[PDB]
Amino acid sequence: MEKSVSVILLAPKQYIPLLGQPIALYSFFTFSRMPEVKEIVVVCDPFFRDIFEEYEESIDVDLSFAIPGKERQDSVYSGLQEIDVNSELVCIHDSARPLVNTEDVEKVLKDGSAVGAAVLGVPAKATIKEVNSDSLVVKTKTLWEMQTPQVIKPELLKKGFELVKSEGLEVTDDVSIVEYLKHPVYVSQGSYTNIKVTTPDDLLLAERILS
Amino acid sequence: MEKSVSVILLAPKQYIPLLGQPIALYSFFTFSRMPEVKEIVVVCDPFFRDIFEEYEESIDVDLSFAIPGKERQDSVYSGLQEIDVNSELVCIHDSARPLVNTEDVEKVLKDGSAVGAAVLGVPAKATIKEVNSDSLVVKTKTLWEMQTPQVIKPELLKKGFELVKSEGLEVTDDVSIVEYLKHPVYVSQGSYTNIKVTTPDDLLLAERILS
Numbered sequence A, B: 001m002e003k004s005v006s007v008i009l010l011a012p013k014q015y016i017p018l019l020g021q022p023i024a025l026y027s028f029f030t031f032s033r034m035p036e037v038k039e040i041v042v043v044c045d046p047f048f049r050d051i052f053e054e055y056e057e058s059i060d061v062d063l064s065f066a067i068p069g070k071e072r073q074d075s076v077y078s079g080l081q082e083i084d085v086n087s088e089l090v091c092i093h094d095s096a097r098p099l100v101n102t103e104d105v106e107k108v109l110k111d112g113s114a115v116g117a118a119v120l121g122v123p124a125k126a127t128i129k130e131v132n133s134d135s136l137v138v139k140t141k142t143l144w145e146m147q148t149p150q151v152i153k154p155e156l157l158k159k160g161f162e163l164v165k166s167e168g169l170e171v172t173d174d175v176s177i178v179e180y181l182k183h184p185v186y187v188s189q190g191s192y193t194n195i196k197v198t199t200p201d202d203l204l205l206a207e208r209i210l211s
């Protein structure tokens, strides 16, 4: 368990400071303090490499870097190439979610270890309906909003990339490389506080949360 | 079309002022100015009756009142009893959504007239997954977040209430009286700005929208 997890940190709105510190550094430090986390392979444009470099000697993890790709999955694959040969879990996180709780990361790590694949989620508070191509409600289910981390064993993630490669399967917002696997995905119940940061509305909320 | 629609306005966070005016009055006035709207049957506790009474002579609609019930559907039925005998559409709206645009109300009214039942919605921006009782993703759809107005012909709404009455069918968050009808429900594409107001986060966003 200890030093068993590689974080792929996916990292402009993620470098806007929140209560003075850049957004991307909040999750970076949350992961670094966890004894389970062994390395953080950070995915960022070389302009921002220094932003993480500054804190390298203080943190109790291996810092490494990767170049981003066009779409989210390209950046994950890039990060996956630098992880440890003996890492037991990869922990993929969106740097735009600075407020993830250590306790919720612990939960999804534990669930990922047990199941093979787990993602942090919350019950969708809004009333959500399926709508067909004619704009009609498909009438009838517990729907969940998916956050990050996404925690997965590296052999599973690799098999996902290889299946989509070999058969040339299409990949979208809601249908990733791992959606094509028969291997189950567990949904670990997180916190509504683990919001993503895009709008300036999010900062005015996120400061309220941090306090 | 003109003077053809009865609004049931469902109406504490809906009486917190936004840029100085109570939240419930924003939608109230939006509906009152529309030539299609004939009456606003307002659903509120008698303490707040005066809040709408003040503006009665200025508005170009019939103001009426109804007592709320325990759950949302009880308040709708209460409001439904005061509507016009010759009203062609009932337009059910949550007063906690003060920012609905006239143009979007026009759209859902037109769709409700054509289809019999229509609701304002937006594509769900979050990644939403179905999760089973064992907390596993049900792998595979266009999902939409439902707002208000909900626009429906009164005979349809009545038939919904009577079917649930007669058979004693169960009613929840996601399965209303109208979900049990075979009659189609159209989803009119609205605006992401049409947010519901509960948290103080919403006010700090809603003021940004209004400007």
Ligand SMILES: Oc1c(Br)cc(Br)cc1-c1cc(C(F)(F)F)no1
Pocket: A072, A073, A074, A076, A077, A092, A117, A118, A119, A150, A151, A152, A176, A177, A178, A179, A185, B137
């Ligand atoms: O789509 C997933 C689900 Br569902 C669960 C878990 Br765990 C991980 C993923 C996931 C997607 C990707 C990306 F490469 F496409 F970005 N990497 O991992």
Ligand SMILES: Oc1c(Br)cc(Br)cc1-c1cc(C(F)(F)F)no1
Pocket: A137, B072, B073, B074, B076, B077, B092, B117, B118, B119, B150, B151, B152, B176, B177, B178, B179, B185
């Ligand atoms: O559930 C609906 C859908 Br789906 C569409 C439309 Br249009 C209207 C409704 C609806 C629900 C109710 C309530 F009485 F339960 F509150 N009244 O109308």
Ligand SMILES: [K+]
Pocket: A061, A062, A063
């Ligand atoms: K190092």
Ligand SMILES: [K+]
Pocket: A084, A085, A086, A087
């Ligand atoms: K190692």
Ligand SMILES: [K+]
Pocket: B061, B062, B063
């Ligand atoms: K009147």
Ligand SMILES: [K+]
Pocket: B084, B085, B086, B087
């Ligand atoms: K009348």
